[PDB]
Amino acid sequence: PGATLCLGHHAVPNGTIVKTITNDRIEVTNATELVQNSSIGEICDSPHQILDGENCTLIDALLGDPQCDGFQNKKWDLFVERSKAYSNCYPYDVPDYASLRSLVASSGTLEFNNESFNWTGVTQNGTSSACIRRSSSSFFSRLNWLTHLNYKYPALNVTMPNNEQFDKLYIWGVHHPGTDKDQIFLYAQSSGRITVSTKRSQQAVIPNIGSRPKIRDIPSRISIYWTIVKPGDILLINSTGNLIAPRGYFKIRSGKSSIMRSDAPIGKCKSECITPNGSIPNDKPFQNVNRITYGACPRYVKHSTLKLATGMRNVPE
Amino acid sequence: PGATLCLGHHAVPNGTIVKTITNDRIEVTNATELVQNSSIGEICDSPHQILDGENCTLIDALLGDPQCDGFQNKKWDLFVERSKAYSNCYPYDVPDYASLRSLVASSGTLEFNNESFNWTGVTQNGTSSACIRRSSSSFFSRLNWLTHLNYKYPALNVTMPNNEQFDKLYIWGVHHPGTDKDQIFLYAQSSGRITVSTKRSQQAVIPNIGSRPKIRDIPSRISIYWTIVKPGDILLINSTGNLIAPRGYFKIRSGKSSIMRSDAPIGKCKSECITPNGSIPNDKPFQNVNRITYGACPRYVKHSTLKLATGMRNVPE
Amino acid sequence: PGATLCLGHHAVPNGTIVKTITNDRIEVTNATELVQNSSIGEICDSPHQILDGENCTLIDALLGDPQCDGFQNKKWDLFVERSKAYSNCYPYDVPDYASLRSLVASSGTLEFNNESFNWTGVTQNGTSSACIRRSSSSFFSRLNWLTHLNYKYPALNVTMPNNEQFDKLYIWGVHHPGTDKDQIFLYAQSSGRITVSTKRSQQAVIPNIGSRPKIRDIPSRISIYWTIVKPGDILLINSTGNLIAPRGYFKIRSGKSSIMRSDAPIGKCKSECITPNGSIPNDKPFQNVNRITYGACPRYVKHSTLKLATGMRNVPE
Numbered sequence A, B, C: 001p002g003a004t005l006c007l008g009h010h011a012v013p014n015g016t017i018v019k020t021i022t023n024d025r026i027e028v029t030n031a032t033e034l035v036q037n038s039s040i041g042e043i044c045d046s047p048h049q050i051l052d053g054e055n056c057t058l059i060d061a062l063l064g065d066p067q068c069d070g071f072q073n074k075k076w077d078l079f080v081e082r083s084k085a086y087s088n089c090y091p092y093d094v095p096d097y098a099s100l101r102s103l104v105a106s107s108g109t110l111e112f113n114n115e116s117f118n119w120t121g122v123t124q125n126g127t128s129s130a131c132i133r134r135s136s137s138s139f140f141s142r143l144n145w146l147t148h149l150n151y152k153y154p155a156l157n158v159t160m161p162n163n164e165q166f167d168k169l170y171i172w173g174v175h176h177p178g179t180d181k182d183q184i185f186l187y188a189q190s191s192g193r194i195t196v197s198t199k200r201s202q203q204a205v206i207p208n209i210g211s212r213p214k215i216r217d218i219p220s221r222i223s224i225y226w227t228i229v230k231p232g233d234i235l236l237i238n239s240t241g242n243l244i245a246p247r248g249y250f251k252i253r254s255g256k257s258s259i260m261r262s263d264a265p266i267g268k269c270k271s272e273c274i275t276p277n278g279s280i281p282n283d284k285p286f287q288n289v290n291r292i293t294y295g296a297c298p299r300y301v302k303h304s305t306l307k308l309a310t311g312m313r314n315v316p317e
């Protein structure tokens, strides 16, 4: 009689199809998905420090648009800019806007220190009905609109040394009046000049007079510039008109901070990986949710599914 | 007596050498080449819509150099620029030429809609012997050279609303006269100013007077600028001299269009993949013909040959 | 009785741990390191031609700062810039400094040919106590500071044809005086204009008057520009003041030359691969010494060690 001894292996009734080098569809006992394809639709507020911009762009929070006063001196790991955001102060532009936005985002702080420039011979604190703060005509909080005093605008030549151990970021601008009359009414002379310099840089700007389309009834514009002043260096502002002066400096830091455009709500939860769609889990090595990511994130790929076999070939009877 | 039964495999008299992980040269029964190394030397005119630039750059076709009048309102998937191309109109430059070329190429259309600006107080339609159209002094078709009327150039302040559902691309410029006399002869005053703006952008230009080397006897130059006007926005042109005005706007589209520099002839044939050398077949995954490609193309690699084994090791007797 | 015949394999007492696809730590008989992790701490002077900048940046050697006179007409495969380098001539800046540095570095030569411009009506060879050469007030060797002659600065309109078979690189500048008085004292009129052009390019610059912080007692600044003139083209310089003129042109070549920032000493030895840390051997395919490399170099990776098995699994008794 004797015996029979058979060697064999398991199988399952519910196998999974995977791809290999030689076969686009082969059934195995089990697999695991390597492409994360969903978000929870909210940005978790831990572990990254999230600052919700609400109605404010980062640049408006920097300059000090009145609706952004709550952002003064705030810090973030990730600043979230919303598509509903709008400007509601004096009309302005920023040559190389994207660069100023990037460098502030990456710095992660709006910490601002006031400095006394001792502006002498000019009127300070110019305001506009385009920039309403507490029902009164106002202006960007961090900027100082200088105009004539007694129909004289005497040449400004002002120094501010950096005696600190850190870099200072100065934000300033040039006012472009809508007409030649407005140039006189504000600066009591026909041609402004601004030169802002350090030992290692110089920026010279000429206003360009002319009508731009009216925003909150203003055909004029301000153009925003920035200057970084290193320790041991000196800021030198030399101007005969059209200066929108700084009130102080921002701390500029280095670290892990950034900015992201998203309409996802902020949630009370923990997730290392943030996308504009919301936080996503980061167990899987890849994801197809969004190319835009912040934190410890799976790598973006253009595959909806990649199944890794975790078992042998499934061979049912 | 019994029998012998031998197991074995085929071989061929004409084997092919391939590379593996362990051997740089090993003979197999057959292989296939994975690097496409040739073109047919012509750009096939299907399935992509090809527009042969002939003597015209895309920028000259845009501005309306007289030799390019046949390109008015044409559309393309791929615009082909030839090395024989030359300019034959008023001498000009384009600050960020490469960007204007790119954005027009990518748009894929020179569709142009005329608009009436109602220029009042100035002479329109200035011409030059540097730009001959039908044996007569002429000018860029899409540009309007404004000069004084009765030795007055009254300030221009003109609006053009965008009430359409699409974006408008405006092309305009500034004339830089060769001398201070020419400035007077043309604009009847010493200092032109141009400000072109929308609600969301501003461009201010000052002419720079001086002699450039003479091209078709002209020591002056035009510098070309562009402005995109979104729906609900307004173009505002404010100028006291030196304006080379737009005659209307170009449609700006998004899609799959591009531009390529090539001297290859156009052929009547079908090929998905275009290179400057000519169309190439796209069966193989890689190619060493050209890094520059358009369409469904093999990936460029720096290998002249990569043979994929399609058979076993060849072991002749 | 009979016999026993045992098949087997070697083992070693000192095996090495490697990683595989299925096991992060498995012992093999031998391995080799694929990541080069050290430099010899000196830049070997063969086979690449090395030029040690010493106290000079490449840009200072180009302009002709007095401490850099030893670099006139020198050539390099790799220019080495040291962190101790400092400028000691007239204070200047270069709009797009990084681009001028790159294009000169890549060219590999400071070969300079003098040309006679025949400046008539102006004083040549202006000097400054900010730029001392042999205990005397001097200036950048390759630049010519033109000022008034007999309180007239007659308009300059000068040509220089390129009748050579190669491209010419012209370096020139604009002087920005510290005050309106200095503008008069130097150029005998209130508003300088510079226009430098060829048949295919134009650069127009306006000086910007104003105080910058004093460097070697100078509140003024020069801004440096460049112009490439092709064979058959012509340089045209047209100016009414504030021109810092070229004395000739640099040869601009193409080849394998570059520039590197390093404090490593130069050594008498041979090594194909240079990093800022020093030369490294290039037997291994990868390295973690520095992302910055020049020559035949292993590829930079973020791994400290990658051991390639060169023997079987080690299975001691």
Ligand SMILES: CC(=O)N[C@@H]1[C@@H](O)[C@H](O[C@@H]2O[C@H](CO[C@]3(C(=O)O)C[C@H](O)[C@@H](NC(C)=O)[C@H]([C@H](O)[C@H](O)CO)O3)[C@H](O)[C@H](O)[C@H]2O)[C@@H](CO)O[C@H]1O
Pocket (backbone or CB within 6 Å): A125, A126, A127, A128, A129, A130, A137, A145, A147, A177, A178, A182, A185, A186, A217, A218, A219, A220
């Ligand atoms: C210097 C001055 O008071 N100039 C008067 C013009 O402002 C005025 O033109 C009207 O200005 C209207 C808006 O007015 C303000 C504003 O923005 O709210 C008033 C501000 O006090 C003034 N700011 C400063 C620091 O002087 C500001 C500024 O002049 C403009 O913003 C520059 O463009 O203007 C509004 O724009 C009207 O449409 C406009 O007509 C004229 C005539 O009304 O009188 C001027 O004396």
Ligand SMILES: CC(=O)N[C@@H]1[C@@H](O)[C@H](O[C@@H]2O[C@H](CO[C@]3(C(=O)O)C[C@H](O)[C@@H](NC(C)=O)[C@H]([C@H](O)[C@H](O)CO)O3)[C@H](O)[C@H](O)[C@H]2O)[C@@H](CO)O[C@H]1O
Pocket (backbone or CB within 6 Å): B125, B126, B127, B128, B129, B130, B137, B145, B147, B177, B178, B182, B185, B186, B217, B218, B219, B220
């Ligand atoms: C406004 C005017 O007519 N000015 C006269 C100068 O053009 C002229 O200088 C000569 O100009 C020659 C080329 O002449 C045109 C041209 O480009 O064909 C004639 C055009 O009608 C004129 N265009 C307009 C809209 O006015 C145009 C323009 O003035 C220039 O292109 C600007 O640079 O010039 C050629 O360049 C000669 O070399 C040049 O001497 C002078 C003296 O001849 O008379 C002026 O009244």
Ligand SMILES: CC(=O)N[C@@H]1[C@@H](O)[C@H](O[C@@H]2O[C@H](CO[C@]3(C(=O)O)C[C@H](O)[C@@H](NC(C)=O)[C@H]([C@H](O)[C@H](O)CO)O3)[C@H](O)[C@H](O)[C@H]2O)[C@@H](CO)O[C@H]1O
Pocket (backbone or CB within 6 Å): C125, C126, C127, C128, C129, C130, C137, C145, C147, C177, C178, C182, C185, C186, C217, C218, C219, C220
């Ligand atoms: C044209 C002239 O001689 N102007 C005199 C001013 O230079 C002078 O101001 C003082 O200038 C001091 C430095 O002087 C030089 C220099 O850089 O060494 C002397 C040079 O010859 C001159 N170069 C040329 C080509 O003229 C040069 C130039 O004027 C300046 O560099 C432009 O900024 O100046 C130093 O900066 C002192 O701090 C400054 O007061 C005034 C009064 O002293 O007299 C002017 O006539």
Ligand SMILES: *[C@@H]1O[C@H](CO)[C@@H](O[C@@H]2O[C@H](CO)[C@@H](O)[C@H](O)[C@H]2NC(C)=O)[C@H](O)[C@H]1NC(C)=O
Pocket (backbone or CB within 6 Å): A030, A031, A032, A310
């Ligand atoms: C199919 O394979 C997957 C992947 O190994 C298994 O999922 C793991 O299950 C363990 C135990 O439940 C968990 O701790 C892990 O989190 C899971 N890993 C992953 C990557 O998801 C799954 O259990 C297997 N299915 C069967 C029937 O064995």
Ligand SMILES: *[C@@H]1O[C@H](CO)[C@@H](O[C@@H]2O[C@H](CO)[C@@H](O)[C@H](O)[C@H]2NC(C)=O)[C@H](O)[C@H]1NC(C)=O
Pocket (backbone or CB within 6 Å): A178, A179, A211, A212, A213, A214, A219, B157, B158, B159, B234, B236
């Ligand atoms: C230049 O033209 C514009 C457009 O007509 C003028 O601005 C308009 O002015 C009217 C009347 O005050 C306002 O109702 C409109 O809101 C303005 N439109 C825009 C688009 O701004 C402008 O005032 C003119 N410039 C000058 C200096 O008179």
Ligand SMILES: *[C@@H]1O[C@H](CO)[C@@H](O[C@@H]2O[C@H](CO)[C@@H](O)[C@H](O)[C@H]2NC(C)=O)[C@H](O)[C@H]1NC(C)=O
Pocket (backbone or CB within 6 Å): A155, A156, A157, A193, A194, A195, A238, A239, A240, C179, C209, C210, C211
């Ligand atoms: C920078 O500030 C200086 C110093 O205040 C200005 O120079 C003065 O300008 C006034 C008005 O033009 C003159 O009356 C004085 O004679 C000048 N003073 C000196 C010491 O020269 C200069 O105008 C300012 N420059 C700019 C670009 O605004």
Ligand SMILES: *[C@@H]1O[C@H](CO)[C@@H](O[C@@H]2O[C@H](CO)[C@@H](O)[C@H](O)[C@H]2NC(C)=O)[C@H](O)[C@H]1NC(C)=O
Pocket (backbone or CB within 6 Å): A037, A038, A039, A276, A277, A288, A289, A290
């Ligand atoms: C995450 O957000 C992205 C970006 O919004 C989504 O992709 C876009 O979806 C819209 C409308 O469904 C398409 O018209 C766009 O073409 C998509 N953009 C891109 C850049 O691909 C994406 O579907 C979202 N993913 C998840 C999982 O919610």
Ligand SMILES: *[C@@H]1O[C@H](CO)[C@@H](O[C@@H]2O[C@H](CO)[C@@H](O)[C@H](O)[C@H]2NC(C)=O)[C@H](O)[C@H]1NC(C)=O
Pocket (backbone or CB within 6 Å): B030, B031, B032, B310
């Ligand atoms: C060598 O292998 C190649 C690749 O499989 C074979 O080429 C294919 O041949 C079939 C039938 O003729 C064609 O339909 C395919 O277009 C070819 N494929 C490729 C990638 O070129 C070739 O026939 C084989 N040679 C032999 C002798 O069997």
Ligand SMILES: *[C@@H]1O[C@H](CO)[C@@H](O[C@@H]2O[C@H](CO)[C@@H](O)[C@H](O)[C@H]2NC(C)=O)[C@H](O)[C@H]1NC(C)=O
Pocket (backbone or CB within 6 Å): B178, B179, B211, B212, B213, B214, B219, C157, C158, C159, C234, C236
């Ligand atoms: C500035 O100099 C240039 C160069 O000499 C002058 O342009 C030349 O003028 C002559 C005589 O008309 C022509 O034959 C040449 O073709 C011109 N050469 C170039 C390179 O353009 C120019 O006219 C001078 N500028 C002024 C305002 O007189």
Ligand SMILES: *[C@@H]1O[C@H](CO)[C@@H](O[C@@H]2O[C@H](CO)[C@@H](O)[C@H](O)[C@H]2NC(C)=O)[C@H](O)[C@H]1NC(C)=O
Pocket (backbone or CB within 6 Å): A179, A209, A210, A211, B155, B156, B157, B193, B194, B195, B238, B239, B240
């Ligand atoms: C923009 O257009 C406006 C309005 O036409 C110009 O302002 C007029 O300019 C003339 C000439 O200088 C003056 O006589 C008028 O008094 C101005 N009108 C008004 C209502 O202020 C202005 O000059 C133009 N601006 C530019 C930059 O060209």
Ligand SMILES: *[C@@H]1O[C@H](CO)[C@@H](O[C@@H]2O[C@H](CO)[C@@H](O)[C@H](O)[C@H]2NC(C)=O)[C@H](O)[C@H]1NC(C)=O
Pocket (backbone or CB within 6 Å): B037, B038, B039, B276, B277, B288, B289, B290
């Ligand atoms: C396709 O065109 C490219 C670009 O013209 C050819 O490569 C160039 O060939 C010239 C002259 O033979 C060389 O001097 C250049 O160095 C090459 N350029 C580059 C960027 O490599 C290429 O040989 C052509 N290929 C085919 C198959 O026709």
Ligand SMILES: *[C@@H]1O[C@H](CO)[C@@H](O[C@@H]2O[C@H](CO)[C@@H](O)[C@H](O)[C@H]2NC(C)=O)[C@H](O)[C@H]1NC(C)=O
Pocket (backbone or CB within 6 Å): C030, C031, C032, C310
């Ligand atoms: C361990 O393996 C390495 C790599 O093959 C051996 O190193 C080689 O040794 C030969 C002969 O000494 C040299 O010519 C090569 O330069 C070495 N190659 C590398 C990549 O370093 C080493 O000899 C082996 N060890 C043992 C005990 O066999």
Ligand SMILES: *[C@@H]1O[C@H](CO)[C@@H](O[C@@H]2O[C@H](CO)[C@@H](O)[C@H](O)[C@H]2NC(C)=O)[C@H](O)[C@H]1NC(C)=O
Pocket (backbone or CB within 6 Å): A157, A158, A159, A234, A236, C178, C179, C211, C212, C213, C214, C219
């Ligand atoms: C503008 O202000 C600066 C700063 O006070 C003046 O430059 C200083 O001048 C003093 C006196 O000569 C020197 O001791 C300092 O070295 C200078 N400081 C700096 C930072 O440059 C400058 O002279 C003023 N401008 C004018 C035109 O008077």
Ligand SMILES: *[C@@H]1O[C@H](CO)[C@@H](O[C@@H]2O[C@H](CO)[C@@H](O)[C@H](O)[C@H]2NC(C)=O)[C@H](O)[C@H]1NC(C)=O
Pocket (backbone or CB within 6 Å): B179, B209, B210, B211, C155, C156, C157, C193, C194, C195, C238, C239, C240
């Ligand atoms: C370029 O050079 C030309 C020619 O020398 C200059 O034109 C002369 O300028 C002077 C002074 O303004 C006048 O008196 C002459 O009448 C002009 N000559 C001619 C032939 O027109 C011109 O000023 C210079 N341009 C620049 C921008 O510097």
Ligand SMILES: *[C@@H]1O[C@H](CO)[C@@H](O[C@@H]2O[C@H](CO)[C@@H](O)[C@H](O)[C@H]2NC(C)=O)[C@H](O)[C@H]1NC(C)=O
Pocket (backbone or CB within 6 Å): C037, C038, C039, C276, C277, C288, C289, C290
């Ligand atoms: C080679 O040089 C690099 C760059 O200096 C060294 O890496 C830096 O080391 C410093 C101080 O040890 C760190 O603070 C920096 O973060 C490092 N920089 C970067 C970009 O990583 C590197 O250690 C040197 N390597 C060797 C082998 O000498």
Ligand SMILES: *[C@@H]1O[C@H](CO)[C@@H](O)[C@H](O)[C@H]1NC(C)=O
Pocket (backbone or CB within 6 Å): A054, A055, A067
């Ligand atoms: C944002 O702006 C909208 C519309 O003006 C307003 O209703 C809303 O209250 C604002 N939200 C905040 C948080 O300021």
